[PDB]
Design a protein around this motif. Sequence first.
Motif, PDB file in Angstrom:
ATOM      1  N   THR A  45      28.641  85.035 -40.995  1.00  0.00           N
ATOM      2  CA  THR A  45      29.866  84.431 -41.682  1.00  0.00           C
ATOM      3  C   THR A  45      30.307  83.365 -41.300  1.00  0.00           C
ATOM      4  OG1 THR A  45      31.717  85.618 -40.877  1.00  0.00           O
ATOM      5  CG2 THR A  45      30.352  86.891 -42.577  1.00  0.00           C
ATOM      6  N   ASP A  90      33.659  82.963 -49.033  1.00  0.00           N
ATOM      7  CA  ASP A  90      33.267  82.547 -47.944  1.00  0.00           C
ATOM      8  C   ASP A  90      32.645  81.037 -48.341  1.00  0.00           C
ATOM      9  OD1 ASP A  90      33.821  84.081 -45.539  1.00  0.00           O
ATOM     10  OD2 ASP A  90      31.674  84.824 -45.556  1.00  0.00           O
ATOM     11  N   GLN A 125      29.889  80.684 -50.059  1.00  0.00           N
ATOM     12  CA  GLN A 125      28.414  80.531 -50.305  1.00  0.00           C
ATOM     13  C   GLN A 125      28.180  80.388 -51.898  1.00  0.00           C
ATOM     14  OE1 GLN A 125      26.924  79.957 -47.758  1.00  0.00           O
ATOM     15  NE2 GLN A 125      27.906  81.101 -46.031  1.00  0.00           N
TER      16      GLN A 125
END
Lengths: 268, 396
Positions: A77, B290, B292
């Motif tokens: 991440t 995040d 994405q």
Amino acid sequence: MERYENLFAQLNDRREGAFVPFVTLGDPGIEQSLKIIDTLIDAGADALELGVPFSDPLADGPTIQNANLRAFAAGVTPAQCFEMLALIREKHPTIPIGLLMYANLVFNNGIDAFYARCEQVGVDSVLVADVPVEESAPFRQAALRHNIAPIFICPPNADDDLLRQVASYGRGYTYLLSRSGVTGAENRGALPLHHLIEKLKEYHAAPALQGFGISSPEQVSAAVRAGAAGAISGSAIVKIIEKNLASPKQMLAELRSFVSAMKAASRA
Amino acid sequence: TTLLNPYFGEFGGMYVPQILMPALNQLEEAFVSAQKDPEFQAQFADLLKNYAGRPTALTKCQNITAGTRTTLYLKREDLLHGGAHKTNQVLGQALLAKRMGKSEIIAETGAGQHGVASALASALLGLKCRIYMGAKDVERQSPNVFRMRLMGAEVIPVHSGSATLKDACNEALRDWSGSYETAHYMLGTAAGPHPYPTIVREFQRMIGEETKAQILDKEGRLPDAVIACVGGGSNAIGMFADFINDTSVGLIGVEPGGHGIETGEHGAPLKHGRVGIYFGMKAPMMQTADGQIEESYSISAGLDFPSVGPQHAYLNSIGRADYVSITDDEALEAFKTLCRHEGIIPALESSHALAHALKMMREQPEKEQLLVVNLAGRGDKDIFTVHDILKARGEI
Ligand SMILES: Cc1ncc(COP(=O)(O)O)c(/C=N/[C@@H](CO)C(=O)O)c1O
Ligand SMILES: O=P(O)(O)OCCNS(=O)(=O)c1ccc(OC(F)(F)F)cc1
Ligand SMILES: [Cl-]
Ligand SMILES: [Cl-]
Ligand SMILES: [Cl-]
Ligand SMILES: [Cl-]
Ligand SMILES: [Cs+]
Ligand SMILES: [Cs+]
């Protein structure tokens, strides 16, 4: 950005180009990636370009697409990437660390906040692959406020206005793009870039690093001979990772010899 | 620098790698030039009329509204050659490719409709066509893939990322970044980097233009609202454009609500996503915490674009247009209702728009309202999906 200025000054003094590998952070896992990066440095990398895994890396060929996928498979991440970056900087005080980003990851938690975090972990430069100079203002502003060099692309088909803009706004280094297309070692640049290198110097641009398609010692030497400050190699490095997923030991061995050879070629 | 503003308010822009900026500039200039060129306009009109079959009917749906004060018309883009609105703008973009001396076409597709439209335009006009399609979409859209291949196009499955439309979008740009001197990227919705949202709008605007003339002729006044489904935004903006300055006319866009907004399994980023920067534009996105990029979920394959055209985000921001969502089950009911009451099998995509119109009617059945739904596609393609659902529900 001051790490780049210091690097280039020292390399100039040694009559050497910079050799700059690219890897994706966390490929093929966090721990393995950390070992990979330390190996690149130990073998003679002058600076690093480090990719943060992104869902849609649309400036990347399949080699680096696969690196992103492998990092995703390991569950890497952006937060974990910031932690990795802090540790890399903690281990190595002077090596310039540049990130290869896509716009959404920079924009996600706020552009200012992104660059502030970059400053906190000791990053030196950020190249945002899908932000052209035309759209760059909020990124370059946030970068500079946080002592981060904004990296601009100088495409092989740059006109004079683009050269002057990149020269004015860039810091750290100027990315001298080898060719059209996307990242990948299976495609070598065609056009001599001597003229662009000269024009960038005329305009007091940040020193040029040639990137895209650099996979061989002769290309590193060629970049230096043409007047660039050095060369970036990504896909060629990542292929060694891909090739040796089943043998971490052989991986590091092959990375070491490759990086050692490419760096050796940077000597003028 | 550009000729036209790349932004609609805060949304839009040109977020492509530097290498593609000359391609976008060239395209913008050629478009601006084409729009002033009577020869270009004549050729476009010729293809639209004589090849694609324009103008399309505006059908009054009397049975479906019986017992309410709703009058409902359907703009029949389902009757267009190819069976969806996608055909309109591919003909214009293919002429632009020819204007610029490009001899090759790159297109992305998800459901396959845009791919089919790109393929047919390319065949007619003698361009070599390659279509990128996420491998998962190739697998589930065998019929469309075969149609594309029958028309001589190369269909390239894309296995990277999620192997779906966004991944095909990426692949198209990657190709273009290395082929733009000879190939034109025929983007299939009113999204992506400038000048695509502008060009797609202008090459779809006949939908709304015709609708306006047709409704004035039939009803003697403008509609109270025009309603269209919103995948990436092309059919909707095509319907809206000519009405934007008619501020008495409501503009309603319908995003897929999937299994329900609250489940997160939907495709409604304009109202329920988060602004991000991707596929060349700043726009509302389906995205993780995040940053994405995520897929859009809908029962209807063609509402899978995980973002939305910047002009829609802008029209929403200023309150000129209103955006809503319709769930899978709502869309399915509307599908069944039109089949039974009007003898028209609608695309499941446009079934979302119809579903919202039926809701406007049913919720306030004594409200006097003149509505146009853009029937952007026919639903022949959907009967297997519908069959399988109905079977699982023991409705058949
Ligand atoms: C029959 C139909 N109606 C509406 C839409 C929605 O498209 P806009 O919002 O009008 O641009 C689509 C889209 N299809 C794309 C994406 O899968 C494609 O074919 O590749 C469609 O096929
Ligand atoms: O050796 P290769 O061919 O893999 O190229 C190296 C790629 N790694 S990188 O971070 O320099 C890099 C630099 C710029 C990129 O896109 C952009 F030009 F649009 F900005 C993408 C990657
Ligand atoms: Cl060179
Ligand atoms: Cl400078
Ligand atoms: Cl008409
Ligand atoms: Cl209402
Ligand atoms: Cs009625
Ligand atoms: Cs959508």
